[PDB]
Amino acid sequence: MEEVVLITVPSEEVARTIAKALVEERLAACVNIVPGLTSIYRWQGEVVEDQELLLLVKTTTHAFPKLKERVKALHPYTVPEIVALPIAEGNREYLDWLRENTG
Amino acid sequence: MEEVVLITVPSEEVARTIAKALVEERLAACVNIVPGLTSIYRWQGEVVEDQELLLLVKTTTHAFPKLKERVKALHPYTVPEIVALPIAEGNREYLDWLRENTG
Amino acid sequence: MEEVVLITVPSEEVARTIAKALVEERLAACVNIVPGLTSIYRWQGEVVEDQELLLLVKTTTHAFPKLKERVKALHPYTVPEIVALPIAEGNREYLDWLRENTG
């Protein structure tokens, strides 16, 4: 089954490097980089704020384990956000393309 | 039945044309246009990069068939991205509004 | 179950107010604020436009009830958009951190 994976990154350099690696390695068919995020989260009991970018990764459920391994290898954070949202339905031509361009 | 549909487009013009049509035609209760995307994907087997915008469509599975048809008619890409993410739960009054303002 | 909640707000001021509150109150582990949204939606027989910002809230189904309550108390809209998308799978360490920082 196809999924849209969300990944937040600290900079455009990390956004581009991870985005390119995932597509190049066939772990994703496409990756969108959304810039300008202001992120507020908890870290060791403190609430902190930082500027980030969001990656939207179009991939499949069986590509997830390797995708995670590669993202962790490239991401500067010890616990990076990598969460997959299920694609309940989509246009057939697109889903076929996604499948054909992954794995 | 409620879902959030993601569609990427090449320009603000196409974004607005599609957003307007979907809500006007009761295929969506609302559409968010997110600008500034950088997209990295597979085309003809090779890795390319392009600039795009993201549409977040609030709709339902009942509206999806016609939504797909209309997006394809109004979208320049040969294979446009039209993927639905399911809404697992939400503010009751908002979901009621979404269901009422769609179809 | 872990979820990504979407909320649209009218200004950065409301975005920040809700973002800080949910995280400080442990109703969410992190909140991303995405600016620059153009929203096209239905108001009766009219298709209207407005500027907004998007909040991506990392939380759980268990915090959702209280999260909805707090968002409504801090949101100027009569019917704020609060919809949850299910996280099918994710980086184990990340989901652990998410659950440990939300109640």
PDB file of N, CA, C and O in Angstrom, chain A residues 19-61:
ATOM      1  N   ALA A  19      15.966  14.431   0.158  1.00  0.00           N
ATOM      2  CA  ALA A  19      14.991  14.304  -0.932  1.00  0.00           C
ATOM      3  C   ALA A  19      15.607  13.634  -2.151  1.00  0.00           C
ATOM      4  O   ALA A  19      15.011  12.731  -2.738  1.00  0.00           O
ATOM      5  N   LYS A  20      16.802  14.075  -2.528  1.00  0.00           N
ATOM      6  CA  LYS A  20      17.479  13.510  -3.683  1.00  0.00           C
ATOM      7  C   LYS A  20      17.875  12.063  -3.474  1.00  0.00           C
ATOM      8  O   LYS A  20      17.714  11.233  -4.370  1.00  0.00           O
ATOM      9  N   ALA A  21      18.386  11.753  -2.286  1.00  0.00           N
ATOM     10  CA  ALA A  21      18.814  10.391  -1.991  1.00  0.00           C
ATOM     11  C   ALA A  21      17.655   9.387  -2.043  1.00  0.00           C
ATOM     12  O   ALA A  21      17.788   8.300  -2.605  1.00  0.00           O
ATOM     13  N   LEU A  22      16.513   9.750  -1.465  1.00  0.00           N
ATOM     14  CA  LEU A  22      15.379   8.843  -1.452  1.00  0.00           C
ATOM     15  C   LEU A  22      14.838   8.533  -2.849  1.00  0.00           C
ATOM     16  O   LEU A  22      14.478   7.395  -3.135  1.00  0.00           O
ATOM     17  N   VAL A  23      14.778   9.537  -3.717  1.00  0.00           N
ATOM     18  CA  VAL A  23      14.278   9.317  -5.074  1.00  0.00           C
ATOM     19  C   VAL A  23      15.326   8.545  -5.893  1.00  0.00           C
ATOM     20  O   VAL A  23      15.009   7.550  -6.555  1.00  0.00           O
ATOM     21  N   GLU A  24      16.575   8.994  -5.808  1.00  0.00           N
ATOM     22  CA  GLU A  24      17.693   8.360  -6.510  1.00  0.00           C
ATOM     23  C   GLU A  24      17.781   6.877  -6.179  1.00  0.00           C
ATOM     24  O   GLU A  24      17.995   6.036  -7.056  1.00  0.00           O
ATOM     25  N   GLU A  25      17.611   6.557  -4.905  1.00  0.00           N
ATOM     26  CA  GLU A  25      17.699   5.175  -4.461  1.00  0.00           C
ATOM     27  C   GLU A  25      16.419   4.350  -4.630  1.00  0.00           C
ATOM     28  O   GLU A  25      16.372   3.191  -4.224  1.00  0.00           O
ATOM     29  N   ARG A  26      15.401   4.950  -5.245  1.00  0.00           N
ATOM     30  CA  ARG A  26      14.112   4.298  -5.499  1.00  0.00           C
ATOM     31  C   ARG A  26      13.332   3.951  -4.231  1.00  0.00           C
ATOM     32  O   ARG A  26      12.558   2.987  -4.196  1.00  0.00           O
ATOM     33  N   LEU A  27      13.534   4.751  -3.190  1.00  0.00           N
ATOM     34  CA  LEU A  27      12.833   4.554  -1.930  1.00  0.00           C
ATOM     35  C   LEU A  27      11.582   5.437  -1.917  1.00  0.00           C
ATOM     36  O   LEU A  27      10.744   5.354  -1.014  1.00  0.00           O
ATOM     37  N   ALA A  28      11.479   6.285  -2.933  1.00  0.00           N
ATOM     38  CA  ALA A  28      10.344   7.185  -3.102  1.00  0.00           C
ATOM     39  C   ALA A  28      10.273   7.586  -4.569  1.00  0.00           C
ATOM     40  O   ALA A  28      11.300   7.675  -5.252  1.00  0.00           O
ATOM     41  N   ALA A  29       9.062   7.839  -5.056  1.00  0.00           N
ATOM     42  CA  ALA A  29       8.888   8.227  -6.449  1.00  0.00           C
ATOM     43  C   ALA A  29       8.986   9.737  -6.579  1.00  0.00           C
ATOM     44  O   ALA A  29       9.371  10.263  -7.622  1.00  0.00           O
ATOM     45  N   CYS A  30       8.635  10.428  -5.501  1.00  0.00           N
ATOM     46  CA  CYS A  30       8.650  11.878  -5.480  1.00  0.00           C
ATOM     47  C   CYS A  30       8.766  12.382  -4.052  1.00  0.00           C
ATOM     48  O   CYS A  30       8.312  11.722  -3.114  1.00  0.00           O
ATOM     49  N   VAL A  31       9.368  13.555  -3.899  1.00  0.00           N
ATOM     50  CA  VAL A  31       9.508  14.187  -2.589  1.00  0.00           C
ATOM     51  C   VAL A  31       9.264  15.685  -2.725  1.00  0.00           C
ATOM     52  O   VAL A  31       9.904  16.334  -3.543  1.00  0.00           O
ATOM     53  N   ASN A  32       8.329  16.228  -1.942  1.00  0.00           N
ATOM     54  CA  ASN A  32       8.059  17.665  -1.977  1.00  0.00           C
ATOM     55  C   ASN A  32       8.706  18.278  -0.752  1.00  0.00           C
ATOM     56  O   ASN A  32       8.645  17.707   0.339  1.00  0.00           O
ATOM     57  N   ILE A  33       9.320  19.439  -0.934  1.00  0.00           N
ATOM     58  CA  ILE A  33       9.948  20.145   0.168  1.00  0.00           C
ATOM     59  C   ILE A  33       9.127  21.406   0.413  1.00  0.00           C
ATOM     60  O   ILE A  33       9.019  22.257  -0.465  1.00  0.00           O
ATOM     61  N   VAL A  34       8.524  21.507   1.593  1.00  0.00           N
ATOM     62  CA  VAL A  34       7.742  22.684   1.937  1.00  0.00           C
ATOM     63  C   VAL A  34       8.622  23.513   2.871  1.00  0.00           C
ATOM     64  O   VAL A  34       9.000  23.056   3.946  1.00  0.00           O
ATOM     65  N   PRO A  35       8.974  24.738   2.466  1.00  0.00           N
ATOM     66  CA  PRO A  35       9.827  25.561   3.332  1.00  0.00           C
ATOM     67  C   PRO A  35       9.068  26.480   4.290  1.00  0.00           C
ATOM     68  O   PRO A  35       7.838  26.498   4.310  1.00  0.00           O
ATOM     69  N   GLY A  36       9.829  27.223   5.095  1.00  0.00           N
ATOM     70  CA  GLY A  36       9.259  28.185   6.028  1.00  0.00           C
ATOM     71  C   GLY A  36       8.495  27.747   7.263  1.00  0.00           C
ATOM     72  O   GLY A  36       7.705  28.527   7.789  1.00  0.00           O
ATOM     73  N   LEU A  37       8.713  26.530   7.752  1.00  0.00           N
ATOM     74  CA  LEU A  37       8.008  26.093   8.952  1.00  0.00           C
ATOM     75  C   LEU A  37       8.618  26.646  10.238  1.00  0.00           C
ATOM     76  O   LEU A  37       9.833  26.775  10.360  1.00  0.00           O
ATOM     77  N   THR A  38       7.750  26.974  11.185  1.00  0.00           N
ATOM     78  CA  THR A  38       8.174  27.408  12.503  1.00  0.00           C
ATOM     79  C   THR A  38       7.718  26.200  13.310  1.00  0.00           C
ATOM     80  O   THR A  38       6.543  25.835  13.267  1.00  0.00           O
ATOM     81  N   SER A  39       8.641  25.554  14.012  1.00  0.00           N
ATOM     82  CA  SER A  39       8.293  24.379  14.796  1.00  0.00           C
ATOM     83  C   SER A  39       8.462  24.599  16.289  1.00  0.00           C
ATOM     84  O   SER A  39       9.497  25.101  16.737  1.00  0.00           O
ATOM     85  N   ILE A  40       7.437  24.209  17.043  1.00  0.00           N
ATOM     86  CA  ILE A  40       7.424  24.319  18.498  1.00  0.00           C
ATOM     87  C   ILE A  40       7.227  22.910  19.037  1.00  0.00           C
ATOM     88  O   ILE A  40       6.207  22.261  18.771  1.00  0.00           O
ATOM     89  N   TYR A  41       8.214  22.421  19.782  1.00  0.00           N
ATOM     90  CA  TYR A  41       8.138  21.062  20.310  1.00  0.00           C
ATOM     91  C   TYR A  41       8.809  20.913  21.665  1.00  0.00           C
ATOM     92  O   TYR A  41       9.482  21.827  22.139  1.00  0.00           O
ATOM     93  N   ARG A  42       8.625  19.752  22.279  1.00  0.00           N
ATOM     94  CA  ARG A  42       9.227  19.497  23.574  1.00  0.00           C
ATOM     95  C   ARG A  42      10.539  18.755  23.405  1.00  0.00           C
ATOM     96  O   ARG A  42      10.670  17.859  22.565  1.00  0.00           O
ATOM     97  N   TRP A  43      11.522  19.157  24.193  1.00  0.00           N
ATOM     98  CA  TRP A  43      12.829  18.525  24.168  1.00  0.00           C
ATOM     99  C   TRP A  43      13.314  18.470  25.612  1.00  0.00           C
ATOM    100  O   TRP A  43      13.517  19.506  26.236  1.00  0.00           O
ATOM    101  N   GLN A  44      13.474  17.260  26.138  1.00  0.00           N
ATOM    102  CA  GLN A  44      13.936  17.061  27.510  1.00  0.00           C
ATOM    103  C   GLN A  44      13.267  17.983  28.532  1.00  0.00           C
ATOM    104  O   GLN A  44      13.946  18.605  29.348  1.00  0.00           O
ATOM    105  N   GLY A  45      11.942  18.072  28.480  1.00  0.00           N
ATOM    106  CA  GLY A  45      11.217  18.907  29.425  1.00  0.00           C
ATOM    107  C   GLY A  45      11.069  20.378  29.067  1.00  0.00           C
ATOM    108  O   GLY A  45      10.298  21.093  29.706  1.00  0.00           O
ATOM    109  N   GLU A  46      11.805  20.843  28.064  1.00  0.00           N
ATOM    110  CA  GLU A  46      11.720  22.244  27.657  1.00  0.00           C
ATOM    111  C   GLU A  46      10.933  22.366  26.357  1.00  0.00           C
ATOM    112  O   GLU A  46      10.948  21.457  25.528  1.00  0.00           O
ATOM    113  N   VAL A  47      10.238  23.484  26.190  1.00  0.00           N
ATOM    114  CA  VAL A  47       9.488  23.730  24.966  1.00  0.00           C
ATOM    115  C   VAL A  47      10.365  24.671  24.153  1.00  0.00           C
ATOM    116  O   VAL A  47      10.631  25.796  24.574  1.00  0.00           O
ATOM    117  N   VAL A  48      10.842  24.203  23.004  1.00  0.00           N
ATOM    118  CA  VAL A  48      11.717  25.013  22.170  1.00  0.00           C
ATOM    119  C   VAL A  48      11.106  25.346  20.814  1.00  0.00           C
ATOM    120  O   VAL A  48      10.113  24.743  20.405  1.00  0.00           O
ATOM    121  N   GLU A  49      11.706  26.314  20.126  1.00  0.00           N
ATOM    122  CA  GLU A  49      11.233  26.748  18.816  1.00  0.00           C
ATOM    123  C   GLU A  49      12.378  26.765  17.800  1.00  0.00           C
ATOM    124  O   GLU A  49      13.509  27.118  18.136  1.00  0.00           O
ATOM    125  N   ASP A  50      12.085  26.392  16.555  1.00  0.00           N
ATOM    126  CA  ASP A  50      13.112  26.359  15.524  1.00  0.00           C
ATOM    127  C   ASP A  50      12.484  26.471  14.139  1.00  0.00           C
ATOM    128  O   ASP A  50      11.289  26.227  13.961  1.00  0.00           O
ATOM    129  N   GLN A  51      13.293  26.861  13.163  1.00  0.00           N
ATOM    130  CA  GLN A  51      12.823  26.989  11.792  1.00  0.00           C
ATOM    131  C   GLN A  51      13.160  25.684  11.088  1.00  0.00           C
ATOM    132  O   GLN A  51      14.283  25.195  11.193  1.00  0.00           O
ATOM    133  N   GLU A  52      12.190  25.111  10.384  1.00  0.00           N
ATOM    134  CA  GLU A  52      12.414  23.846   9.693  1.00  0.00           C
ATOM    135  C   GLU A  52      11.760  23.832   8.316  1.00  0.00           C
ATOM    136  O   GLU A  52      11.164  24.817   7.889  1.00  0.00           O
ATOM    137  N   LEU A  53      11.905  22.703   7.628  1.00  0.00           N
ATOM    138  CA  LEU A  53      11.297  22.478   6.319  1.00  0.00           C
ATOM    139  C   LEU A  53      10.647  21.111   6.416  1.00  0.00           C
ATOM    140  O   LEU A  53      11.118  20.247   7.152  1.00  0.00           O
ATOM    141  N   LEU A  54       9.564  20.912   5.678  1.00  0.00           N
ATOM    142  CA  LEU A  54       8.846  19.639   5.713  1.00  0.00           C
ATOM    143  C   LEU A  54       9.017  18.868   4.409  1.00  0.00           C
ATOM    144  O   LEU A  54       8.952  19.454   3.331  1.00  0.00           O
ATOM    145  N   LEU A  55       9.256  17.561   4.502  1.00  0.00           N
ATOM    146  CA  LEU A  55       9.356  16.747   3.295  1.00  0.00           C
ATOM    147  C   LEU A  55       8.114  15.872   3.251  1.00  0.00           C
ATOM    148  O   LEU A  55       7.695  15.336   4.276  1.00  0.00           O
ATOM    149  N   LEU A  56       7.520  15.757   2.067  1.00  0.00           N
ATOM    150  CA  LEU A  56       6.353  14.909   1.843  1.00  0.00           C
ATOM    151  C   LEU A  56       6.878  13.852   0.871  1.00  0.00           C
ATOM    152  O   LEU A  56       7.143  14.142  -0.292  1.00  0.00           O
ATOM    153  N   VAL A  57       7.021  12.626   1.355  1.00  0.00           N
ATOM    154  CA  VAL A  57       7.580  11.545   0.552  1.00  0.00           C
ATOM    155  C   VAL A  57       6.517  10.578   0.032  1.00  0.00           C
ATOM    156  O   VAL A  57       5.757  10.022   0.816  1.00  0.00           O
ATOM    157  N   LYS A  58       6.462  10.382  -1.283  1.00  0.00           N
ATOM    158  CA  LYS A  58       5.485   9.454  -1.865  1.00  0.00           C
ATOM    159  C   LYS A  58       6.207   8.123  -2.023  1.00  0.00           C
ATOM    160  O   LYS A  58       7.093   7.982  -2.870  1.00  0.00           O
ATOM    161  N   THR A  59       5.808   7.147  -1.218  1.00  0.00           N
ATOM    162  CA  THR A  59       6.473   5.855  -1.210  1.00  0.00           C
ATOM    163  C   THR A  59       5.487   4.725  -0.896  1.00  0.00           C
ATOM    164  O   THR A  59       4.266   4.932  -0.921  1.00  0.00           O
ATOM    165  N   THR A  60       6.012   3.536  -0.609  1.00  0.00           N
ATOM    166  CA  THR A  60       5.169   2.380  -0.292  1.00  0.00           C
ATOM    167  C   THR A  60       5.520   1.786   1.064  1.00  0.00           C
ATOM    168  O   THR A  60       6.607   2.015   1.600  1.00  0.00           O
ATOM    169  N   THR A  61       4.599   1.005   1.616  1.00  0.00           N
ATOM    170  CA  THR A  61       4.808   0.412   2.924  1.00  0.00           C
ATOM    171  C   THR A  61       6.042  -0.487   3.074  1.00  0.00           C
ATOM    172  O   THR A  61       6.657  -0.513   4.139  1.00  0.00           O
TER     173      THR A  61
END
